[PDB]
mmCIF file of C-alpha atoms and ligand atoms in Angstrom:
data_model
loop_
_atom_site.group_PDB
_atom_site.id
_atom_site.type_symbol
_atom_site.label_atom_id
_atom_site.label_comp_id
_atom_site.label_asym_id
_atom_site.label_seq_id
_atom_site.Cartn_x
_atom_site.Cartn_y
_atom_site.Cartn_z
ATOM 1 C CA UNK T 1 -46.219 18.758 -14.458
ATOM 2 C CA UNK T 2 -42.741 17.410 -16.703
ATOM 3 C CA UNK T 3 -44.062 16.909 -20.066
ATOM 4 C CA UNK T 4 -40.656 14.351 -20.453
ATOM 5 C CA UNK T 5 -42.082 12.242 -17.251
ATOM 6 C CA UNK T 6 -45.527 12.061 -19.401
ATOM 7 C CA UNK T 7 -44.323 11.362 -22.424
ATOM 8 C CA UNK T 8 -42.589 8.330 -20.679
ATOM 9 C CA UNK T 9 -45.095 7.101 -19.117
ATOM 10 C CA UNK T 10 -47.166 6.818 -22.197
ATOM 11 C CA UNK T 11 -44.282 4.846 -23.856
ATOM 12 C CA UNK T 12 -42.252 7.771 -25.588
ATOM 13 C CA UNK T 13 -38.593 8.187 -24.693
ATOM 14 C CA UNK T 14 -38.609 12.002 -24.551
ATOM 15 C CA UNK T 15 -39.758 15.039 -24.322
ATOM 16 C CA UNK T 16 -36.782 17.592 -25.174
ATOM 17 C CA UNK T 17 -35.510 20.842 -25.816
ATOM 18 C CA UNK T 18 -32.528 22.729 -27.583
ATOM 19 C CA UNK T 19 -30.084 24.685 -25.079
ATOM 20 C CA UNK T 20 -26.414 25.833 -25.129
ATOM 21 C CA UNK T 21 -24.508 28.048 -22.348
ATOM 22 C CA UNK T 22 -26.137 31.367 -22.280
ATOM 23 C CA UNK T 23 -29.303 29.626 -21.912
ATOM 24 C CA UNK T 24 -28.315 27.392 -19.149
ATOM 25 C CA UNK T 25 -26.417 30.801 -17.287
ATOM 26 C CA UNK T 26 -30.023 32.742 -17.150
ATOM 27 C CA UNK T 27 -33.214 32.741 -16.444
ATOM 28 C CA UNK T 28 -35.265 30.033 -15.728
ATOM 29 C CA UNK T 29 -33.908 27.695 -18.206
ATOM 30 C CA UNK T 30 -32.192 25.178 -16.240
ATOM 31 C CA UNK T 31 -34.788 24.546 -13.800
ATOM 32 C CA UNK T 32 -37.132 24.376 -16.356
ATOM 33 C CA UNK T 33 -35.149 21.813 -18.374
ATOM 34 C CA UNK T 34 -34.432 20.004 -15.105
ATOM 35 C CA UNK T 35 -37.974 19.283 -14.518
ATOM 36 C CA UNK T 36 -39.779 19.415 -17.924
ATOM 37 C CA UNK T 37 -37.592 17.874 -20.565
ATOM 38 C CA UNK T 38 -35.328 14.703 -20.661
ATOM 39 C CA UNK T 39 -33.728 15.064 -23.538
ATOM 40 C CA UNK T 40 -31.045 18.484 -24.231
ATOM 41 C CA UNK T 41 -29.461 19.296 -27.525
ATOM 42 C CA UNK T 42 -26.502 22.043 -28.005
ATOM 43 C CA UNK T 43 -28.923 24.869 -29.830
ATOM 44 C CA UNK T 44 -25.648 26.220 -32.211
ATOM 45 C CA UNK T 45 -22.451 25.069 -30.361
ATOM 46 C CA UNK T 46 -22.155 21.588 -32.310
ATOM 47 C CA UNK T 47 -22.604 23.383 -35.682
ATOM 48 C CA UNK T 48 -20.063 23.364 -38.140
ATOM 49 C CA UNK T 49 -20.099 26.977 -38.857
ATOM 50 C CA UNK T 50 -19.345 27.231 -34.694
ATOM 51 C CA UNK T 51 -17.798 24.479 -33.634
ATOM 52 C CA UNK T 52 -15.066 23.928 -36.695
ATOM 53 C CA UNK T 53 -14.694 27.523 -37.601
ATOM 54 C CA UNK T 54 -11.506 27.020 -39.179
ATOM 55 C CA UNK T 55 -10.104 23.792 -41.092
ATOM 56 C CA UNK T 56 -8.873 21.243 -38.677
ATOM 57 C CA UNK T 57 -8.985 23.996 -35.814
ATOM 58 C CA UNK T 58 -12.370 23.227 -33.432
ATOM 59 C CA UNK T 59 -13.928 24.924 -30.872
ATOM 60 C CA UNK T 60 -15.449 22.460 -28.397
ATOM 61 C CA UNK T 61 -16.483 25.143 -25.121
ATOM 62 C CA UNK T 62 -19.917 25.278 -25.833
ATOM 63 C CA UNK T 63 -21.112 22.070 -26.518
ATOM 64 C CA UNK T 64 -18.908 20.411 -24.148
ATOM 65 C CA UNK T 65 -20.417 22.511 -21.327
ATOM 66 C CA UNK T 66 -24.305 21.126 -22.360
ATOM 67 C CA UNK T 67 -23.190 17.492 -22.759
ATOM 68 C CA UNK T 68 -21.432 18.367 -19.266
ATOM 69 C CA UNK T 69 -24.811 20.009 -17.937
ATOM 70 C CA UNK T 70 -26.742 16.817 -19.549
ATOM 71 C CA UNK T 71 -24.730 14.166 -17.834
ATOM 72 C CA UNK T 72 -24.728 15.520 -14.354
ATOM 73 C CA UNK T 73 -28.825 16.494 -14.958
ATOM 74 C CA UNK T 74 -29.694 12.954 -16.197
ATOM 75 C CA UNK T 75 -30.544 13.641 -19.619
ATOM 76 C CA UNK T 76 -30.766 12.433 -22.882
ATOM 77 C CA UNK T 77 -28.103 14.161 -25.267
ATOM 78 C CA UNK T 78 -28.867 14.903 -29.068
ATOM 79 C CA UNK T 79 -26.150 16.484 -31.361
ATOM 80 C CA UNK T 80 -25.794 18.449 -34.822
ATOM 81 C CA UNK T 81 -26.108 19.033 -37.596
ATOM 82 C CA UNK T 82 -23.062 17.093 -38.869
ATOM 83 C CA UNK T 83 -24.047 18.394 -42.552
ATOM 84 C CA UNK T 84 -25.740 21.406 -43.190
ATOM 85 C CA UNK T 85 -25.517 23.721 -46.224
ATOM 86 C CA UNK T 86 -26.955 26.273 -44.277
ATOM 87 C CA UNK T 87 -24.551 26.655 -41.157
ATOM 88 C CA UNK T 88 -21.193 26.259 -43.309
ATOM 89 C CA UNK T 89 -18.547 28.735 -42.578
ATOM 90 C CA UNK T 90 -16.545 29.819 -45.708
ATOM 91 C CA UNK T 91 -13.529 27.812 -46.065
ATOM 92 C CA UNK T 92 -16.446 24.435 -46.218
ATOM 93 C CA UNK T 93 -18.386 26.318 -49.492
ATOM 94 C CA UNK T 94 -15.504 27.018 -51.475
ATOM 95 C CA UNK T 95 -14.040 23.736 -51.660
ATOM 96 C CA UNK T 96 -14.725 22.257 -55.139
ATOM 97 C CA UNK T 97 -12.431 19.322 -55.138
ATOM 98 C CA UNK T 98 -14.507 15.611 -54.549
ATOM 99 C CA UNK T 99 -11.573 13.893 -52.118
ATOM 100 C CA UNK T 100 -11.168 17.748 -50.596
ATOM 101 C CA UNK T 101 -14.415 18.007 -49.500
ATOM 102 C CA UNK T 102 -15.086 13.985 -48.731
ATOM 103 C CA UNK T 103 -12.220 14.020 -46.018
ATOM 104 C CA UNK T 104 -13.359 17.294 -44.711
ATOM 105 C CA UNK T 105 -16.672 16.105 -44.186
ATOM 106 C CA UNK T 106 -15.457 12.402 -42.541
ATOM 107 C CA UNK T 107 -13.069 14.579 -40.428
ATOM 108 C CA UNK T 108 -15.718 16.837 -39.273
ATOM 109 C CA UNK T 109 -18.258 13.768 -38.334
ATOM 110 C CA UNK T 110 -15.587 11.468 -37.263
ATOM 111 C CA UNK T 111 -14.326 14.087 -34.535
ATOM 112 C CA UNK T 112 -17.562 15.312 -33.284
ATOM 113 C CA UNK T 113 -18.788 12.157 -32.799
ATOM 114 C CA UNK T 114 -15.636 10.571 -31.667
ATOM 115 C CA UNK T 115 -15.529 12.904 -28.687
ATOM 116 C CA UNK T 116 -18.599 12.113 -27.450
ATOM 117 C CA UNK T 117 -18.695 8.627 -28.061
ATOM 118 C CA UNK T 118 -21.592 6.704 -25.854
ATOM 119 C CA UNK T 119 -23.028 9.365 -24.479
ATOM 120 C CA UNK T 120 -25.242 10.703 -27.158
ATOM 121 C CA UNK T 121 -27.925 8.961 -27.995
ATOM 122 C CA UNK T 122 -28.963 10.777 -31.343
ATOM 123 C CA UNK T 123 -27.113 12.453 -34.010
ATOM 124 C CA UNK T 124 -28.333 14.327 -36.669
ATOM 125 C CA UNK T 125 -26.100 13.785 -39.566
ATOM 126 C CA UNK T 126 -27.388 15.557 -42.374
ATOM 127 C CA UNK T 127 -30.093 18.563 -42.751
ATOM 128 C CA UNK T 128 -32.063 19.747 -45.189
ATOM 129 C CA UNK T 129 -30.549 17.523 -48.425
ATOM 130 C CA UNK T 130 -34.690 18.349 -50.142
ATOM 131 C CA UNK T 131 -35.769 20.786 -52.029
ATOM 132 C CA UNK T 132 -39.104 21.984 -51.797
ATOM 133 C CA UNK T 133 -39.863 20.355 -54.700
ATOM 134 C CA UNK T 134 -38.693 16.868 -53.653
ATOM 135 C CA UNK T 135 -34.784 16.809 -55.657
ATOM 136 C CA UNK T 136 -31.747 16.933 -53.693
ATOM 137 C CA UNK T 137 -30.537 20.332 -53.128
ATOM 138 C CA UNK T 138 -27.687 21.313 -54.462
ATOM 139 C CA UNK T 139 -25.675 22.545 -51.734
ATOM 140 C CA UNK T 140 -22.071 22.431 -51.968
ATOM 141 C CA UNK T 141 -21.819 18.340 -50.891
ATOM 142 C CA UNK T 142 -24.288 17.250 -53.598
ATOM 143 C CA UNK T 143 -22.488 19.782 -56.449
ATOM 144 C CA UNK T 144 -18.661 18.139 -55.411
ATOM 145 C CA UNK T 145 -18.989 14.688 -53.573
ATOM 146 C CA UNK T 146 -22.784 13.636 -55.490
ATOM 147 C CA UNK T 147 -25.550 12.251 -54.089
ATOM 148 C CA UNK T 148 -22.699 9.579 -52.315
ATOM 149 C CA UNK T 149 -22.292 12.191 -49.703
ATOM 150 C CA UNK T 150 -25.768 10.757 -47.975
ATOM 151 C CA UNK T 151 -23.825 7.162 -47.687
ATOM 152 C CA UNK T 152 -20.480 8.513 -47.122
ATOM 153 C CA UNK T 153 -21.905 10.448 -44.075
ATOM 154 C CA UNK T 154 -24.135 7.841 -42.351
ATOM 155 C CA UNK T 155 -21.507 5.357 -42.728
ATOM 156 C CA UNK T 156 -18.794 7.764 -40.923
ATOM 157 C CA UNK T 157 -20.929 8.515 -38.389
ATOM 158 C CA UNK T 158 -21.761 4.629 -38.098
ATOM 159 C CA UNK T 159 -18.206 3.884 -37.872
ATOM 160 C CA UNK T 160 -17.410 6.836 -35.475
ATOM 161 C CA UNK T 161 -20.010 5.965 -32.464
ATOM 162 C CA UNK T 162 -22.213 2.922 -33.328
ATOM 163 C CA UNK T 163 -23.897 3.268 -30.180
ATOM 164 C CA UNK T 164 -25.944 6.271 -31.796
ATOM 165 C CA UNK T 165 -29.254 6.472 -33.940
ATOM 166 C CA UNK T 166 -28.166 8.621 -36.956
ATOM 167 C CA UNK T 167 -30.928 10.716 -38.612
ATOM 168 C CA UNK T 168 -31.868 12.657 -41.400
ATOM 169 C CA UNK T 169 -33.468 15.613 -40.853
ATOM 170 C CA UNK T 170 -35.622 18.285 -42.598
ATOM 171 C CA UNK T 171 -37.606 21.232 -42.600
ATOM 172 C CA UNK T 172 -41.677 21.275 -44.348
ATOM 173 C CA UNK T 173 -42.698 17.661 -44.259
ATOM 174 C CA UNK T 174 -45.477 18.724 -42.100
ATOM 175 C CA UNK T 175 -48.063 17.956 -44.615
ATOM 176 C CA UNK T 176 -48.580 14.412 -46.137
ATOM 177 C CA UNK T 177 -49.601 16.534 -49.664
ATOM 178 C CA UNK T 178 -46.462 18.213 -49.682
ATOM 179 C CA UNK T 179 -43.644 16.497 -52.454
ATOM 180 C CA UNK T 180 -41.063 16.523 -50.367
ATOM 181 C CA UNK T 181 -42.709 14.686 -47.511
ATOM 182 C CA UNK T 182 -42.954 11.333 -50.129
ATOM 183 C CA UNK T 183 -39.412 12.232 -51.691
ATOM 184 C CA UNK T 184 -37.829 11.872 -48.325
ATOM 185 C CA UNK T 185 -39.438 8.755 -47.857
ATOM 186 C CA UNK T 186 -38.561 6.970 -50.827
ATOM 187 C CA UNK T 187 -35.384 8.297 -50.934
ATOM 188 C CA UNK T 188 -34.642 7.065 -47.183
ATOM 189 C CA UNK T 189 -36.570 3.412 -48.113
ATOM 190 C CA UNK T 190 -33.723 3.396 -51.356
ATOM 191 C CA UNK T 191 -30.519 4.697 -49.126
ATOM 192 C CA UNK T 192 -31.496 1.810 -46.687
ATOM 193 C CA UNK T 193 -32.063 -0.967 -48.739
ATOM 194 C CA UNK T 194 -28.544 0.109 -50.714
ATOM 195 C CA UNK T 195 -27.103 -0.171 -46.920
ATOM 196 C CA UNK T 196 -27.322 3.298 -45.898
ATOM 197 C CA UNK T 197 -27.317 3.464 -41.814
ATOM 198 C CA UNK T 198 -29.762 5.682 -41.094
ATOM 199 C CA UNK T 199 -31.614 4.945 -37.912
ATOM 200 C CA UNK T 200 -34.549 7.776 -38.077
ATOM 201 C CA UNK T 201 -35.817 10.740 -39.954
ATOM 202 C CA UNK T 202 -36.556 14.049 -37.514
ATOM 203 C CA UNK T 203 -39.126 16.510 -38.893
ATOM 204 C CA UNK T 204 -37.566 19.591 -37.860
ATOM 205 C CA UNK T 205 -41.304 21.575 -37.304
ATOM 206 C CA UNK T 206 -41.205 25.181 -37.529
ATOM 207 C CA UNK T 207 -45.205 25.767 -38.138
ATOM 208 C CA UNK T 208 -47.196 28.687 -38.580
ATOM 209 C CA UNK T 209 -50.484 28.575 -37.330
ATOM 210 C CA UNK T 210 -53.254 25.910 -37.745
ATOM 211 C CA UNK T 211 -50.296 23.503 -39.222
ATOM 212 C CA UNK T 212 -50.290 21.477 -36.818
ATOM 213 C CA UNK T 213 -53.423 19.400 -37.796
ATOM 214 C CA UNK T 214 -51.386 18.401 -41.200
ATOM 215 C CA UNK T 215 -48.847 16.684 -38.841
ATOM 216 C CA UNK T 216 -51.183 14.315 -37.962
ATOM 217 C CA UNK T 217 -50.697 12.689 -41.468
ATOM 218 C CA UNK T 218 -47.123 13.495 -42.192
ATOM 219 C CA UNK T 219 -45.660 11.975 -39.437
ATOM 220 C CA UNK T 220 -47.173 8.729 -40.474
ATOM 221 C CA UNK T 221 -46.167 9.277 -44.236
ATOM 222 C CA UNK T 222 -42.814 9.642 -42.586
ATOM 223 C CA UNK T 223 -42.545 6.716 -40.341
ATOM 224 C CA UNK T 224 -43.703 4.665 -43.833
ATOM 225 C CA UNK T 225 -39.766 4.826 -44.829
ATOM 226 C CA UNK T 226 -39.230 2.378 -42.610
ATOM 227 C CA UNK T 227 -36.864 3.552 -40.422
ATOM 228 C CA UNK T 228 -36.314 2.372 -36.879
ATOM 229 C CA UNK T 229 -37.788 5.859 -35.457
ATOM 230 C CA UNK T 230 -38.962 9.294 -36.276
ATOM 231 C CA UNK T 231 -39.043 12.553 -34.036
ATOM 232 C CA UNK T 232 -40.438 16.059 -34.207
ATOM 233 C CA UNK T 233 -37.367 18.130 -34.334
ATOM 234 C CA UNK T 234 -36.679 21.840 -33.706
ATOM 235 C CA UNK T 235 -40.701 22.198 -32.234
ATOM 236 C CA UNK T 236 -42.332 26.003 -32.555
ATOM 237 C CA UNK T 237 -45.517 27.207 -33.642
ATOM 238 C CA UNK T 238 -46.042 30.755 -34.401
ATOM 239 C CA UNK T 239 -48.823 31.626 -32.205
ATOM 240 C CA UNK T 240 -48.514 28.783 -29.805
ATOM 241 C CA UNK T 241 -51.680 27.777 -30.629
ATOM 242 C CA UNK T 242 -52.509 24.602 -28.024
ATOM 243 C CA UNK T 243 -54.839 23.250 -30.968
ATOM 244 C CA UNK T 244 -51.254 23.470 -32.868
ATOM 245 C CA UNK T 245 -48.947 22.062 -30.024
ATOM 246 C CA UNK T 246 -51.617 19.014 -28.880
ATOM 247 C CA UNK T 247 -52.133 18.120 -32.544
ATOM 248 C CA UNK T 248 -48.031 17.809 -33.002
ATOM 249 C CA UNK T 249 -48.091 15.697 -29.811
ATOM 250 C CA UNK T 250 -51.163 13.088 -30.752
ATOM 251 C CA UNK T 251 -49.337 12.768 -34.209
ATOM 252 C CA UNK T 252 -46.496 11.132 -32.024
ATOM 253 C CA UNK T 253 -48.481 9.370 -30.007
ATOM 254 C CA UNK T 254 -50.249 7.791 -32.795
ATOM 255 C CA UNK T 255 -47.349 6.920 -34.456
ATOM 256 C CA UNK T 256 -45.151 3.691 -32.824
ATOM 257 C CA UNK T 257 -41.921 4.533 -33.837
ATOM 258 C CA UNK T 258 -42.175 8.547 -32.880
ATOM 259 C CA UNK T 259 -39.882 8.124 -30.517
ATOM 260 C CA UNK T 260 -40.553 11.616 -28.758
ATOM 261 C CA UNK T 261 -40.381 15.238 -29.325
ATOM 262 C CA UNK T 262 -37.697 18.131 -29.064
ATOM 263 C CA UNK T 263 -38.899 21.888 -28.830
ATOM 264 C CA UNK T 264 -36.696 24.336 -30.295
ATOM 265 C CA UNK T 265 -36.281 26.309 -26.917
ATOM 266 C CA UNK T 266 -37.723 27.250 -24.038
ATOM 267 C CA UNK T 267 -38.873 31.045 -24.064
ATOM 268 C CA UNK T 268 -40.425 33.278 -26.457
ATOM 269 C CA UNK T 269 -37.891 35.533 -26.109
ATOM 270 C CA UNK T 270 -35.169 33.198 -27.054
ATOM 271 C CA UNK T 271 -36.898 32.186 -29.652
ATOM 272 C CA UNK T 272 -35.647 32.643 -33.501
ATOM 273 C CA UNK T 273 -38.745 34.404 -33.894
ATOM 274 C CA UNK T 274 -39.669 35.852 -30.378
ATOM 275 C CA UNK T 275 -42.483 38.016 -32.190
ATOM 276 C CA UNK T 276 -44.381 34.968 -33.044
ATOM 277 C CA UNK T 277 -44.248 33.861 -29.900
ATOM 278 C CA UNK T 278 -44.038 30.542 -30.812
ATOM 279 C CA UNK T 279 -42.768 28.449 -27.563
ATOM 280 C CA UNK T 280 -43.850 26.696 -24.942
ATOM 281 C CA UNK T 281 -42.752 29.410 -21.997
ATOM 282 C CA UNK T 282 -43.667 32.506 -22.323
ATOM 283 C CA UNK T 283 -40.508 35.553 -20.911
ATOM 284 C CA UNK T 284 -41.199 35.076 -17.596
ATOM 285 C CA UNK T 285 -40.656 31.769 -18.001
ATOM 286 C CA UNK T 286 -44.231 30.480 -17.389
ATOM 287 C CA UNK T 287 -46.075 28.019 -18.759
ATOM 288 C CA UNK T 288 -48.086 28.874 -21.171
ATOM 289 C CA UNK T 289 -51.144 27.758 -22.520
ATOM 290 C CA UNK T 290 -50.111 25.218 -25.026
ATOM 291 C CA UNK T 291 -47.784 23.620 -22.030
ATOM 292 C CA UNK T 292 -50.997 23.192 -20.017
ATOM 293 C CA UNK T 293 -53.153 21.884 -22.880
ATOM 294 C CA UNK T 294 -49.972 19.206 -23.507
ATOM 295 C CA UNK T 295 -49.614 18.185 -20.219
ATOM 296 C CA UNK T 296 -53.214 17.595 -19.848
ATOM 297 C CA UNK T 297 -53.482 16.205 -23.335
ATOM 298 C CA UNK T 298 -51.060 13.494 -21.938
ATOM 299 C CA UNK T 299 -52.476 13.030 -18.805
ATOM 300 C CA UNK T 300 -55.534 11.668 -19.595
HETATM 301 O O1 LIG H 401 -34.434 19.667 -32.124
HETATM 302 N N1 LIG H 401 -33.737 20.680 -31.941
HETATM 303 O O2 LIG H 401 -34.192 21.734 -31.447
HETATM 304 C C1 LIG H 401 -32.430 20.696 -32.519
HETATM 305 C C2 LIG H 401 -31.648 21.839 -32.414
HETATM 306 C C3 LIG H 401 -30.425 21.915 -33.028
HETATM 307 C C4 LIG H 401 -29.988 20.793 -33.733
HETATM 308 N N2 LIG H 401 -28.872 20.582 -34.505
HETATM 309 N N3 LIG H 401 -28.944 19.376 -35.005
HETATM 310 N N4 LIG H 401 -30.087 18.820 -34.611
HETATM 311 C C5 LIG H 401 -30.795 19.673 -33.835
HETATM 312 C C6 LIG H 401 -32.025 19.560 -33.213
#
């Protein structure tokens, strides 16, 4: 049973899953995303560290062979992250000049996006602009563009491939006590209303165990902002607990504008964390538990 065909036929658009070439090339990965997921994302190969890793100089193999994969499998293509502190390469961070940095960052958004143009249906554009605590972090486009960098890179992106929903995305709003779940709301309700584009806000959900149940409020708290959808991004659970995995899933189905969900990978081993297990296949590619307890979950 395809999670992705369940998901759709209770109303979601997706079930998906992160990928890039050496996945694809091995194992049981294709066939698996063939069947099970509708929805592929390039795991590393659209980010900027990899894909612009010098100035003005871009390396396009990787993620053009997913989006390649993607269109002649039927799926759903998701791309990112446009702006990320945290996958920068070198000559990005040292840039302290405002207009430097601004034009790098419209150039880098403008020409990913441009070269896909229509056939992606998401993008995340920026990642992780919260700290724990609720501020904006002050990564190296908050210290020398401001907090205009948010506008500056939703409108790019607007301009570059309207056909796309633009997100924000970040990491611990999986609990509705949690600052930075609110902070990310009312920041997103503000940046809208001041005629920011963005079109959803993923909840990239890297749990440990028994974190799951916490989702069940968050993602509501989330969808509050107002945007036009949300999505679980970036899906693992150490331990793989199906209590963890079913109570992610019924948060999205109890939420109207959850759009759907994308899992982080396929197998364990592949994993970030392989030790914590924390996937839906397990390194002989078989289902596992939680994949079961989903399917049925959906099912009925
Ligand atoms: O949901 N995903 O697994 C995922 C993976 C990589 C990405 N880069 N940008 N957005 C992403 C989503």
């Amino acid at each position: 049973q395809s999670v992705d065909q369940l998901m759709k036929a209770r109303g979601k658009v997706y079930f998906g899953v992160a990928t890039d070439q050496n996945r694809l090339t091995t194992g049981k990965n294709a066939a698996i995303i063939q069947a099970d997921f509708g929805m592929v994302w390039p795991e590393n190969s659209l980010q900027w560290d990899a894909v612009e890793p010098s100035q003005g100089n871009f390396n396009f193999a990787g993620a053009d062979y997913v989006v390649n994969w993607a269109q002649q499998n039927g799926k759903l293509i998701g791309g990112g992250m446009l702006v990320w502190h945290s996958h920068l390469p070198s000559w990005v961070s040292s840039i302290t000049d405002k207009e430097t940095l601004t034009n790098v960052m419209k150039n880098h958004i403008t020409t990913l996006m441009t070269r896909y143009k229509g056939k992606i249906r998401v993008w995340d554009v920026v990642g992780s602009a919260f700290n724990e605590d609720g501020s904006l972090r002050q990564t190296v486009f908050l210290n020398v563009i401001g907090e205009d960098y948010i506008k500056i890179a939703f409108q790019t992106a607007r301009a570059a491939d309207p056909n796309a929903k633009l997100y924000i995305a970040d990491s611990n709003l999986d609990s509705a006590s949690y600052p930075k779940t609110q902070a990310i709301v009312n920041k997103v309700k503000q940046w809208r209303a001041a005629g920011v584009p963005i079109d959803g806000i993923g909840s990239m959900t890297n749990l440990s165990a028994g974190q799951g149940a916490g989702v069940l409020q968050a993602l509501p708290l989330l969808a509050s902002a107002g945007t036009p959808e949300v999505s679980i991004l970036m899906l693992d659970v150490a331990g793989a607990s199906p209590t963890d995995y079913v109570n992610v899933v019924n948060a999205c189905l109890n939420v109207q504008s959850c759009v759907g969900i994308t899992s982080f990978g396929v197998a364990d081993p592949d994993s970030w964390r392989a030790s914590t297990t924390p996937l839906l296949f397990d390194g002989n590619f078989n289902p596992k538990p939680a994949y079961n307890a989903i399917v049925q979950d959906l099912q009925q």
